[PDB]
Paper text:
Of particular interest is the Bdellovibrio bacteriovorus HD100 nucleoside diphosphate sugar (NDPS) hydrolase Bd3179 because it appears to have some of the characteristics of the Escherichia coli adenosine diphosphate ribose (ADPR) hydrolase and the guanosine diphosphate mannose (GDPM) hydrolase. Bd-NDPSase is a homodimer whose monomers are related by a non-crystallographic 2-fold axis. Each monomer comprises an N-terminal and a Nudix domain. Phosphate release assays revealed that among the nucleoside diphosphate sugars hydrolyzed by Bd-NDPSase, its highest relative activity was with GDPM.
The B-factor of the E140 Cα in apo Bd-NDPSase is 3.1 times larger than that of G115’ on loop L8, and 1.7 times larger than that of Y19 on loop L1, suggesting that loop L9 intrinsic flexibility facilitates substrate binding followed by E140 mediated nucleophilic attack of the scissile phosphate. A product-release mechanism where an arginine (R37 in Bd-NDPSase) completes a “fence” around the nucleoside is posible, but the presence of a sulfate ion in close proximity (4.5 Å) of R37 in the apo structure precludes this analysis.
Residue numbers in the entry:
A (entry chain A): 1 to 182
B (entry chain B): 3 to 182
The structure:
């Protein structure tokens, strides 16, 4: 769909905060005119759907100050210096929840902020789990929970799983558990 | 127990589009940390279901990711208006359609780590086809999509836009008689 593409004419890093880095670009759009585009430079991420032998999934509660709310989430974290996201996922599953998994399957990649960040999140299904113990980062506060997939889907419908990556995980899990996508 | 207490707030950056809030917070360990996030106006996204069973979707380039995306139409809340008003306006501007039947589905948060953005998702039915009225810097092509085709595209990784993918999943639940 080449007639929709925009051509980068210039880029700069316009701002660096404590955490957020902003790129500002001038682009040539399909009209041949120049427009500004601004977006966050993000390292990428992974998220894991950790399926226990008992059929429950391992989830977390975590407070997110950007939204001033505690969210139910699948474990996740940012990609460290261009590592494969499978490594990110293994590490985050262990650090946030204490689990390791013998069976990892890449499901899909999502883009959560197409208007203003280059973030992508690779979503994985982790099976054949065994437990060790949690190891949280400085400034990271997490409660680990087990959730029945049926209860999770009802929470989705009720608006109680508003975190996009985790809601998408729930729907992919549902497709997997029903044997539709497996 | 997990909640962090705001100690101070500052708008540290305002560009052409993006505004960054930086807060000092006291966390559950009693210690102080910085939190940085985008101040976003909020947004609406619309699933427009045609009488033939297809949905109206768009193709749109997104410079932040350097790809053309398949999306449901959407846009940002203006002057803190009711998001249904946002939805009705953006459905007309981006696709050329109006709808006489609107239903709120759910609110999603696409960037919990670094933006206060929420998106309210709506189902739109009973449609009338007028014409697009695109805004500055907007280039959008309208396409009709069969929901079964949409779900296969999701599986294939060809619907990576979170809001759109979630919309597909909700539509699938509605069309299957599961959620109504």
């Amino acid at each position: 769909m080449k007639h929709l593409e925009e051509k980068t004419l210039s880029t700069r890093q316009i701002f660096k905060g404590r955490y957020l880095k902003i790129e500002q670009d001038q682009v040539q759009a399909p009209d041949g005119r120049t427009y500004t585009r601004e977006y966050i430079l993000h390292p990428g991420a992974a998220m894991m759907i950790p399926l226990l032998p008992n059929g429950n999934v391992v989830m977390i509660h975590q407070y997110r100050h950007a939204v001033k709310k505690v969210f139910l989430e699948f474990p996740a974290g940012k990609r460290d210096h261009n590592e494969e996201t499978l490594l990110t996922a293994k590490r985050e599953l262990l650090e946030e929840t204490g689990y390791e998994a013998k069976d990892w399957k890449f499901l899909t990649t999502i883009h959560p902020v197409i208007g203003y960040s280059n973030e992508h999140i690779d979503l994985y299904l982790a099976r054949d789990l065994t437990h060790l113990e949690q190891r949280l980062d400085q400034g990271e506060f997490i409660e680990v929970v087990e959730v029945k997939p049926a209860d999770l889907m009802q929470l989705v419908l009720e608006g109680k799983v508003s975190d996009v990556k985790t809601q998408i995980g729930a729907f992919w899990l549902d497709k997997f558990l029903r044997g539709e996508w497996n």
